[PDB]
Design an enzyme around this catalytic site. Sequence first.
Site, short mmCIF file in Angstrom:
data_model
loop_
_atom_site.label_atom_id
_atom_site.label_comp_id
_atom_site.label_asym_id
_atom_site.label_seq_id
_atom_site.Cartn_x
_atom_site.Cartn_y
_atom_site.Cartn_z
N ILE A 175 -4.15 13.62 5.52
CA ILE A 175 -3.90 12.44 4.69
C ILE A 175 -3.62 11.19 5.53
O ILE A 175 -4.14 10.11 5.23
CB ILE A 175 -2.76 12.72 3.67
N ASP A 215 10.59 8.07 -1.43
CA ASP A 215 10.44 8.49 -2.83
C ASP A 215 11.08 9.86 -3.04
O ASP A 215 11.39 10.55 -2.07
CB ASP A 215 8.96 8.47 -3.29
N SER A 234 -3.64 6.01 5.46
CA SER A 234 -4.22 6.16 6.80
C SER A 234 -4.56 4.81 7.46
O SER A 234 -4.52 4.71 8.69
CB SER A 234 -5.46 7.05 6.75
N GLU A 263 0.84 -1.21 0.00
CA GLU A 263 0.00 0.00 0.00
C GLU A 263 0.87 1.26 0.00
O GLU A 263 0.61 2.19 -0.77
CB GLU A 263 -0.96 0.01 1.20
N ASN A 321 1.62 4.15 -3.25
CA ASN A 321 1.64 5.60 -3.04
C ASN A 321 2.99 6.22 -3.43
O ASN A 321 3.02 7.27 -4.07
CB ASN A 321 1.30 5.94 -1.59
N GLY A 376 -7.01 1.54 -3.87
CA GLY A 376 -6.19 1.26 -2.69
C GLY A 376 -6.90 1.57 -1.38
O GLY A 376 -7.86 2.34 -1.35
N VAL A 377 -6.40 0.97 -0.30
CA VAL A 377 -6.99 1.14 1.04
C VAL A 377 -6.64 2.48 1.71
O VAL A 377 -7.31 2.88 2.66
CB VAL A 377 -6.62 -0.02 2.00
N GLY A 378 -5.61 3.16 1.22
CA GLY A 378 -5.14 4.43 1.77
C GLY A 378 -4.03 4.26 2.80
O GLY A 378 -4.01 3.28 3.54
N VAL A 418 -7.26 10.38 8.08
CA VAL A 418 -8.63 10.32 7.56
C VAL A 418 -8.77 9.14 6.59
O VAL A 418 -7.90 8.92 5.74
CB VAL A 418 -9.04 11.64 6.86
O1 LIG Z 1 -3.13 10.27 -0.10
C1 LIG Z 1 -1.95 10.54 -0.26
C2 LIG Z 1 -0.88 9.64 0.26
C3 LIG Z 1 0.44 9.78 -0.50
C4 LIG Z 1 1.65 9.07 0.07
C5 LIG Z 1 1.53 8.08 1.05
C6 LIG Z 1 2.62 7.34 1.46
C7 LIG Z 1 3.87 7.58 0.89
O2 LIG Z 1 4.94 6.81 1.23
C8 LIG Z 1 4.01 8.58 -0.06
C9 LIG Z 1 2.91 9.31 -0.46
O3 LIG Z 1 0.81 11.17 -0.70
C10 LIG Z 1 -0.16 12.01 -1.19
C11 LIG Z 1 0.28 13.13 -1.86
C12 LIG Z 1 -0.65 14.04 -2.34
O4 LIG Z 1 -0.23 15.15 -3.02
C13 LIG Z 1 -2.01 13.83 -2.14
C14 LIG Z 1 -2.45 12.70 -1.47
O5 LIG Z 1 -3.78 12.55 -1.27
C15 LIG Z 1 -1.52 11.75 -0.98
#
Ligand SMILES: O=C1C[C@H](c2ccc(O)cc2)Oc2cc(O)cc(O)c21
Lengths: 196, 188
Positions: free
Chosen positions: B79, B58, B88, B27, B31, B84-86, B82
Amino acid sequence: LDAVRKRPGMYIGDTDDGTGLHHMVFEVVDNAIDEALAGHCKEIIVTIHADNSVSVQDDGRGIPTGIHPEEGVSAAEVIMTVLDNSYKVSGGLHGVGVSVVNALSQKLELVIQREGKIHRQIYEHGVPQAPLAVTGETEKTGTMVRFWPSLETFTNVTEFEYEILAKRLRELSFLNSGVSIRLRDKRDGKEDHFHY
Amino acid sequence: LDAVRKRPGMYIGDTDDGTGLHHMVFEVVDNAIDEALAGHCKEIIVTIHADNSVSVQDDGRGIPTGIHPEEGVSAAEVIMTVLGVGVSVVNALSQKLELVIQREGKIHRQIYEHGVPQAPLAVTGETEKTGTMVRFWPSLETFTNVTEFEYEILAKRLRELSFLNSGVSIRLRDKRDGKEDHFHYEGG
Ligand SMILES: O=C1C[C@H](c2ccc(O)cc2)Oc2cc(O)cc(O)c21
Ligand SMILES: Nc1nc2ccccc2[nH]1
Protein backbone atom coordinates in the site's frame (compact mmCIF):
# COMPACT_ATOMS: atom_id res chain seq x y z
CA LEU A 1 15.14 0.73 -8.77
CA ASP A 2 13.14 0.54 -5.48
CA ALA A 3 14.16 -3.14 -5.04
CA VAL A 4 17.82 -2.03 -5.12
CA ARG A 5 17.20 0.92 -2.75
CA LYS A 6 15.45 -1.40 -0.27
CA ARG A 7 18.32 -3.94 -0.05
CA PRO A 8 21.46 -2.25 -1.51
CA GLY A 9 23.87 -4.81 0.02
CA MET A 10 22.32 -7.62 -2.05
CA TYR A 11 23.25 -5.92 -5.38
CA ILE A 12 26.43 -3.87 -4.76
CA GLY A 13 28.01 -5.63 -1.72
CA ASP A 14 28.47 -4.75 1.96
CA THR A 15 27.65 -1.05 2.47
CA ASP A 16 29.52 -0.70 5.83
CA ASP A 17 33.00 -2.26 5.29
CA GLY A 18 33.82 -0.53 1.95
CA THR A 19 33.12 -3.53 -0.34
CA GLY A 20 29.98 -1.91 -1.77
CA LEU A 21 31.49 1.59 -2.04
CA HIS A 22 34.36 0.35 -4.22
CA HIS A 23 32.16 -2.04 -6.24
CA MET A 24 30.25 1.10 -7.35
CA VAL A 25 33.43 2.15 -9.19
CA PHE A 26 33.97 -1.37 -10.61
CA GLU A 27 30.43 -1.50 -12.08
CA VAL A 28 31.03 1.82 -13.86
CA VAL A 29 34.48 0.56 -14.98
CA ASP A 30 32.77 -2.61 -16.31
CA ASN A 31 30.50 -0.53 -18.57
CA ALA A 32 33.48 1.60 -19.66
CA ILE A 33 35.65 -1.42 -20.59
CA ASP A 34 32.85 -2.91 -22.75
CA GLU A 35 32.52 0.50 -24.47
CA ALA A 36 36.33 0.91 -24.74
CA LEU A 37 36.53 -2.31 -26.69
CA ALA A 38 35.52 -0.32 -29.76
CA GLY A 39 37.75 2.65 -30.12
CA HIS A 40 40.53 4.81 -31.38
CA CYS A 41 42.64 4.23 -28.33
CA LYS A 42 40.76 1.79 -26.16
CA GLU A 43 41.52 3.83 -23.07
CA ILE A 44 39.68 4.49 -19.82
CA ILE A 45 40.48 7.16 -17.21
CA VAL A 46 39.35 6.56 -13.61
CA THR A 47 39.66 9.74 -11.51
CA ILE A 48 39.15 10.08 -7.75
CA HIS A 49 38.03 13.70 -7.28
CA ALA A 50 38.67 15.87 -4.20
CA ASP A 51 34.92 16.00 -3.32
CA ASN A 52 34.79 12.17 -2.91
CA SER A 53 33.25 11.39 -6.31
CA VAL A 54 34.69 9.08 -8.97
CA SER A 55 34.53 9.70 -12.72
CA VAL A 56 35.18 7.13 -15.45
CA GLN A 57 35.88 8.36 -19.00
CA ASP A 58 36.04 6.06 -22.04
CA ASP A 59 36.71 6.78 -25.72
CA GLY A 60 34.16 4.31 -27.13
CA ARG A 61 31.20 4.79 -29.47
CA GLY A 62 29.03 6.51 -26.82
CA ILE A 63 25.89 5.11 -25.16
CA PRO A 64 22.90 5.18 -27.60
CA THR A 65 20.99 8.48 -27.23
CA GLY A 66 17.87 7.86 -29.40
CA ILE A 67 14.41 7.34 -27.90
CA HIS A 68 13.59 3.82 -26.66
CA PRO A 69 10.29 2.71 -28.37
CA GLU A 70 8.75 1.03 -25.28
CA GLU A 71 9.97 3.32 -22.46
CA GLY A 72 9.51 6.58 -24.42
CA VAL A 73 12.76 8.19 -23.16
CA SER A 74 16.40 8.21 -24.34
CA ALA A 75 18.06 4.77 -24.53
CA ALA A 76 20.77 6.17 -22.22
CA GLU A 77 18.13 6.91 -19.55
CA VAL A 78 16.69 3.37 -19.85
CA ILE A 79 20.20 1.97 -19.16
CA MET A 80 20.58 4.33 -16.14
CA THR A 81 17.07 3.68 -14.67
CA VAL A 82 15.93 0.09 -15.52
CA LEU A 83 17.37 -3.02 -13.84
CA ASP A 84 28.84 -18.88 -12.41
CA ASN A 85 27.49 -17.05 -15.51
CA SER A 86 27.24 -13.75 -13.53
CA TYR A 87 31.00 -13.02 -13.83
CA LYS A 88 32.36 -10.66 -16.52
CA VAL A 89 35.89 -10.10 -17.88
CA SER A 90 35.23 -6.32 -17.73
CA GLY A 91 34.78 -6.82 -13.95
CA GLY A 92 31.10 -6.16 -13.19
CA LEU A 93 28.24 -8.56 -12.48
CA HIS A 94 25.38 -9.46 -14.84
CA GLY A 95 22.13 -8.18 -13.28
CA VAL A 96 23.81 -5.19 -11.57
CA GLY A 97 25.29 -2.57 -13.97
CA VAL A 98 25.15 1.23 -13.89
CA SER A 99 21.42 1.42 -12.95
CA VAL A 100 22.33 0.09 -9.49
CA VAL A 101 25.20 2.63 -9.24
CA ASN A 102 22.81 5.42 -10.28
CA ALA A 103 20.18 4.34 -7.69
CA LEU A 104 22.75 4.45 -4.84
CA SER A 105 24.38 7.77 -5.85
CA GLN A 106 23.18 11.10 -4.40
CA LYS A 107 24.31 12.60 -7.73
CA LEU A 108 25.32 11.13 -11.10
CA GLU A 109 26.55 13.11 -14.13
CA LEU A 110 26.32 11.46 -17.58
CA VAL A 111 28.16 12.94 -20.59
CA ILE A 112 27.94 11.17 -23.98
CA GLN A 113 29.90 12.24 -27.08
CA ARG A 114 28.23 10.61 -30.11
CA GLU A 115 27.37 11.48 -33.74
CA GLY A 116 29.11 14.88 -33.52
CA LYS A 117 27.16 16.01 -30.42
CA ILE A 118 27.72 16.30 -26.65
CA HIS A 119 24.74 14.96 -24.64
CA ARG A 120 24.34 15.69 -20.90
CA GLN A 121 22.08 14.46 -18.09
CA ILE A 122 22.06 14.72 -14.28
CA TYR A 123 20.52 12.24 -11.82
CA GLU A 124 19.92 12.44 -8.06
CA HIS A 125 19.35 9.11 -6.26
CA GLY A 126 18.51 7.53 -9.65
CA VAL A 127 15.92 10.20 -10.57
CA PRO A 128 16.59 12.15 -13.80
CA GLN A 129 16.50 15.94 -13.29
CA ALA A 130 15.81 16.62 -16.98
CA PRO A 131 15.79 14.65 -20.26
CA LEU A 132 19.11 13.80 -21.96
CA ALA A 133 19.92 17.00 -23.88
CA VAL A 134 22.30 18.06 -26.64
CA THR A 135 24.57 20.76 -25.13
CA GLY A 136 27.18 21.22 -27.90
CA GLU A 137 29.26 19.78 -30.73
CA THR A 138 32.37 17.58 -30.64
CA GLU A 139 34.80 15.68 -32.88
CA LYS A 140 35.49 12.96 -30.27
CA THR A 141 33.35 10.04 -29.07
CA GLY A 142 32.94 8.46 -25.63
CA THR A 143 30.99 8.14 -22.38
CA MET A 144 31.76 9.81 -19.04
CA VAL A 145 30.01 8.81 -15.81
CA ARG A 146 30.79 10.72 -12.60
CA PHE A 147 28.97 9.64 -9.43
CA TRP A 148 28.71 10.89 -5.85
CA PRO A 149 27.96 7.91 -3.55
CA SER A 150 24.92 8.32 -1.28
CA LEU A 151 26.19 8.79 2.30
CA GLU A 152 22.77 7.52 3.47
CA THR A 153 23.56 4.09 1.96
CA PHE A 154 27.35 3.89 2.45
CA THR A 155 28.40 4.19 6.12
CA ASN A 156 31.66 3.89 8.11
CA VAL A 157 33.93 3.44 5.04
CA THR A 158 32.77 6.50 3.05
CA GLU A 159 36.05 7.64 1.40
CA PHE A 160 37.61 5.96 -1.65
CA GLU A 161 40.89 4.14 -0.91
CA TYR A 162 43.34 4.42 -3.85
CA GLU A 163 45.03 1.04 -3.27
CA ILE A 164 41.73 -0.91 -3.46
CA LEU A 165 40.92 0.64 -6.87
CA ALA A 166 44.52 0.28 -8.12
CA LYS A 167 44.63 -3.43 -7.19
CA ARG A 168 41.41 -4.24 -9.10
CA LEU A 169 42.31 -2.15 -12.17
CA ARG A 170 45.63 -4.06 -12.39
CA GLU A 171 43.73 -7.40 -12.40
CA LEU A 172 41.40 -6.09 -15.14
CA SER A 173 44.29 -4.92 -17.37
CA PHE A 174 45.52 -8.54 -17.65
CA LEU A 175 42.00 -9.78 -18.55
CA ASN A 176 41.41 -6.86 -20.96
CA SER A 177 44.67 -6.91 -22.91
CA GLY A 178 43.92 -4.26 -25.55
CA VAL A 179 42.61 -1.64 -23.10
CA SER A 180 44.65 1.12 -21.39
CA ILE A 181 43.56 2.00 -17.83
CA ARG A 182 44.71 5.26 -16.19
CA LEU A 183 44.05 5.92 -12.48
CA ARG A 184 44.26 9.47 -11.07
CA ASP A 185 43.88 10.80 -7.51
CA LYS A 186 43.23 14.57 -7.37
CA ARG A 187 43.43 14.58 -3.53
CA ASP A 188 47.22 13.91 -3.44
CA GLY A 189 48.20 13.90 -7.17
CA LYS A 190 48.90 10.13 -7.19
CA GLU A 191 48.57 8.25 -10.50
CA ASP A 192 49.11 4.90 -12.25
CA HIS A 193 48.86 3.49 -15.79
CA PHE A 194 47.82 -0.17 -16.23
CA HIS A 195 48.30 -1.68 -19.71
CA TYR A 196 49.10 -5.27 -20.75
CA LEU B 1 7.31 5.23 -7.21
CA ASP B 2 9.98 6.36 -9.77
CA ALA B 3 7.26 7.97 -11.96
CA VAL B 4 6.16 10.16 -9.01
CA ARG B 5 9.77 11.12 -8.14
CA LYS B 6 10.55 12.14 -11.76
CA ARG B 7 7.60 14.58 -11.90
CA PRO B 8 6.23 15.34 -8.37
CA GLY B 9 4.11 18.32 -9.49
CA MET B 10 1.92 16.16 -11.74
CA TYR B 11 0.70 14.12 -8.72
CA ILE B 12 0.75 16.31 -5.57
CA GLY B 13 0.35 19.78 -7.20
CA ASP B 14 2.49 22.93 -7.01
CA THR B 15 5.55 22.22 -4.83
CA ASP B 16 6.64 25.90 -4.48
CA ASP B 17 3.55 27.92 -3.39
CA GLY B 18 2.49 25.64 -0.48
CA THR B 19 -0.62 24.07 -2.07
CA GLY B 20 1.17 20.76 -2.71
CA LEU B 21 2.59 20.72 0.84
CA HIS B 22 -0.87 20.95 2.44
CA HIS B 23 -2.39 18.50 -0.09
CA MET B 24 -0.01 15.90 1.46
CA VAL B 25 -1.87 16.34 4.78
CA PHE B 26 -5.34 16.24 3.16
CA GLU B 27 -4.54 13.03 1.20
CA VAL B 28 -3.61 11.28 4.47
CA VAL B 29 -6.72 12.76 6.18
CA ASP B 30 -9.05 11.42 3.42
CA ASN B 31 -7.60 7.94 4.03
CA ALA B 32 -7.87 8.33 7.84
CA ILE B 33 -11.51 9.46 7.63
CA ASP B 34 -12.17 6.43 5.54
CA GLU B 35 -10.60 4.17 8.11
CA ALA B 36 -12.40 5.98 10.92
CA LEU B 37 -15.77 5.24 9.44
CA ALA B 38 -15.23 1.57 10.23
CA GLY B 39 -15.02 1.61 14.03
CA HIS B 40 -17.80 2.93 16.30
CA CYS B 41 -15.90 5.70 18.01
CA LYS B 42 -14.85 7.17 14.68
CA GLU B 43 -12.09 9.57 15.62
CA ILE B 44 -9.01 11.02 13.92
CA ILE B 45 -6.33 13.22 15.40
CA VAL B 46 -4.27 15.51 13.22
CA THR B 47 -1.14 16.89 14.94
CA ILE B 48 1.33 19.48 13.61
CA HIS B 49 4.61 18.64 15.39
CA ALA B 50 7.38 21.08 16.36
CA ASP B 51 9.88 19.43 13.95
CA ASN B 52 7.63 20.30 10.95
CA SER B 53 6.03 16.86 10.53
CA VAL B 54 2.31 16.06 10.56
CA SER B 55 0.82 12.91 12.12
CA VAL B 56 -2.69 11.57 11.49
CA GLN B 57 -4.12 8.96 13.88
CA ASP B 58 -7.33 6.99 13.23
CA ASP B 59 -9.18 4.36 15.28
CA GLY B 60 -10.22 2.10 12.38
CA ARG B 61 -9.41 -1.57 11.81
CA GLY B 62 -5.74 -0.89 10.94
CA ILE B 63 -4.07 -1.29 7.53
CA PRO B 64 -3.75 -5.03 6.69
CA THR B 65 -0.41 -6.37 7.98
CA GLY B 66 -0.28 -9.91 6.50
CA ILE B 67 2.03 -10.96 3.67
CA HIS B 68 1.01 -10.07 0.10
CA PRO B 69 1.40 -13.33 -1.92
CA GLU B 70 2.77 -11.72 -5.13
CA GLU B 71 5.04 -9.07 -3.57
CA GLY B 72 6.20 -11.21 -0.61
CA VAL B 73 5.99 -8.29 1.85
CA SER B 74 3.33 -6.94 4.26
CA ALA B 75 0.15 -5.64 2.58
CA ALA B 76 0.82 -2.35 4.42
CA GLU B 77 4.19 -2.01 2.63
CA VAL B 78 2.55 -2.76 -0.75
CA ILE B 79 0.00 0.00 0.00
CA MET B 80 2.80 2.46 0.93
CA THR B 81 5.12 1.63 -2.05
CA VAL B 82 2.83 1.03 -5.10
CA LEU B 83 1.21 3.78 -7.20
CA GLY B 84 -7.31 10.51 -4.55
CA VAL B 85 -3.58 10.42 -5.39
CA GLY B 86 -2.86 7.59 -2.89
CA VAL B 87 -0.80 7.44 0.33
CA SER B 88 2.16 6.05 -1.67
CA VAL B 89 2.55 9.49 -3.33
CA VAL B 90 2.77 11.10 0.15
CA ASN B 91 5.33 8.43 1.15
CA ALA B 92 7.44 9.00 -2.01
CA LEU B 93 7.62 12.78 -1.40
CA SER B 94 8.37 12.48 2.35
CA GLN B 95 12.02 12.43 3.49
CA LYS B 96 10.75 10.34 6.42
CA LEU B 97 7.48 8.54 7.17
CA GLU B 98 6.56 6.59 10.33
CA LEU B 99 3.78 3.97 10.12
CA VAL B 100 2.22 2.50 13.29
CA ILE B 101 -0.64 -0.01 12.89
CA GLN B 102 -2.64 -1.47 15.80
CA ARG B 103 -4.42 -4.65 14.68
CA GLU B 104 -5.20 -8.18 16.00
CA GLY B 105 -3.77 -7.38 19.46
CA LYS B 106 -0.38 -6.20 18.12
CA ILE B 107 1.49 -2.94 17.42
CA HIS B 108 3.23 -2.97 14.02
CA ARG B 109 5.95 -0.41 13.16
CA GLN B 110 7.77 0.60 9.96
CA ILE B 111 9.91 3.57 8.87
CA TYR B 112 10.33 4.88 5.32
CA GLU B 113 12.74 7.42 3.84
CA HIS B 114 11.77 8.91 0.44
CA GLY B 115 9.37 5.96 -0.06
CA VAL B 116 12.02 3.30 0.69
CA PRO B 117 11.27 1.02 3.67
CA GLN B 118 14.23 0.85 6.10
CA ALA B 119 13.17 -2.54 7.49
CA PRO B 120 10.23 -4.98 7.17
CA LEU B 121 7.01 -4.19 9.11
CA ALA B 122 7.70 -5.54 12.61
CA VAL B 123 5.48 -6.45 15.56
CA THR B 124 6.96 -4.43 18.44
CA GLY B 125 4.34 -4.86 21.19
CA GLU B 126 0.77 -5.46 22.35
CA THR B 127 -2.41 -3.37 22.36
CA GLU B 128 -6.16 -3.63 23.05
CA LYS B 129 -6.90 -0.84 20.53
CA THR B 130 -7.02 -0.72 16.72
CA GLY B 131 -6.00 1.96 14.22
CA THR B 132 -3.42 3.45 11.88
CA MET B 133 -0.99 6.31 12.53
CA VAL B 134 0.95 7.94 9.67
CA ARG B 135 3.50 10.64 10.56
CA PHE B 136 5.37 12.21 7.64
CA TRP B 137 8.22 14.69 7.21
CA PRO B 138 7.82 16.47 3.82
CA SER B 139 10.90 16.19 1.59
CA LEU B 140 12.70 19.56 1.53
CA GLU B 141 14.27 18.46 -1.80
CA THR B 142 10.75 18.54 -3.36
CA PHE B 143 8.89 21.18 -1.32
CA THR B 144 10.60 24.58 -1.70
CA ASN B 145 9.92 28.18 -0.58
CA VAL B 146 6.77 27.41 1.48
CA THR B 147 8.04 24.55 3.69
CA GLU B 148 6.14 25.11 6.98
CA PHE B 149 2.54 24.04 7.70
CA GLU B 150 -0.10 26.71 8.33
CA TYR B 151 -2.68 25.99 11.06
CA GLU B 152 -5.51 27.98 9.43
CA ILE B 153 -5.33 26.07 6.10
CA LEU B 154 -5.72 22.74 7.95
CA ALA B 155 -8.24 24.09 10.51
CA LYS B 156 -10.54 25.47 7.79
CA ARG B 157 -10.47 22.30 5.64
CA LEU B 158 -11.07 19.94 8.59
CA ARG B 159 -14.12 22.02 9.62
CA GLU B 160 -15.59 21.76 6.09
CA LEU B 161 -14.91 17.99 6.16
CA SER B 162 -16.65 17.51 9.54
CA PHE B 163 -20.03 18.57 8.07
CA LEU B 164 -19.73 16.00 5.22
CA ASN B 165 -18.70 13.19 7.63
CA SER B 166 -21.35 12.80 10.35
CA GLY B 167 -20.25 11.14 13.61
CA VAL B 168 -16.51 11.52 12.85
CA SER B 169 -14.56 13.33 15.59
CA ILE B 170 -11.74 15.44 14.08
CA ARG B 171 -9.17 16.83 16.54
CA LEU B 172 -6.50 19.28 15.36
CA ARG B 173 -3.44 20.01 17.54
CA ASP B 174 -0.52 22.41 17.02
CA LYS B 175 2.49 21.49 19.19
CA ARG B 176 4.40 24.64 18.08
CA ASP B 177 2.08 27.04 20.00
CA GLY B 178 -0.38 24.71 21.83
CA LYS B 179 -3.40 25.72 19.68
CA GLU B 180 -6.13 23.09 19.19
CA ASP B 181 -9.62 22.52 17.75
CA HIS B 182 -12.30 19.81 17.79
CA PHE B 183 -14.67 19.46 14.82
CA HIS B 184 -17.39 16.89 15.59
CA TYR B 185 -20.69 17.12 13.68
CA GLU B 186 -23.28 14.47 14.66
CA GLY B 187 -26.08 15.36 12.20
CA GLY B 188 -28.42 12.99 10.35
O1 LIG C 1 -4.76 2.33 0.33
C1 LIG C 1 -4.91 2.32 1.54
C2 LIG C 1 -4.37 3.43 2.40
C3 LIG C 1 -5.11 3.58 3.72
C4 LIG C 1 -4.52 4.53 4.74
C5 LIG C 1 -3.54 5.45 4.41
C6 LIG C 1 -3.11 6.41 5.32
C7 LIG C 1 -3.67 6.45 6.59
O2 LIG C 1 -3.31 7.42 7.47
C8 LIG C 1 -4.63 5.51 6.95
C9 LIG C 1 -5.04 4.56 6.03
O3 LIG C 1 -5.32 2.31 4.38
C10 LIG C 1 -5.83 1.28 3.62
C11 LIG C 1 -6.50 0.28 4.30
C12 LIG C 1 -7.00 -0.80 3.58
O4 LIG C 1 -7.68 -1.78 4.23
C13 LIG C 1 -6.82 -0.89 2.20
C14 LIG C 1 -6.14 0.12 1.53
O5 LIG C 1 -5.96 -0.02 0.19
C15 LIG C 1 -5.63 1.24 2.23
N1 LIG D 1 18.00 12.26 -0.04
C1 LIG D 1 17.35 11.36 -0.79
N2 LIG D 1 17.44 10.03 -0.64
C2 LIG D 1 16.62 9.52 -1.65
C3 LIG D 1 16.33 8.19 -1.98
C4 LIG D 1 15.48 7.94 -3.05
C5 LIG D 1 14.94 8.99 -3.79
C6 LIG D 1 15.22 10.31 -3.46
C7 LIG D 1 16.06 10.55 -2.39
N3 LIG D 1 16.54 11.72 -1.83
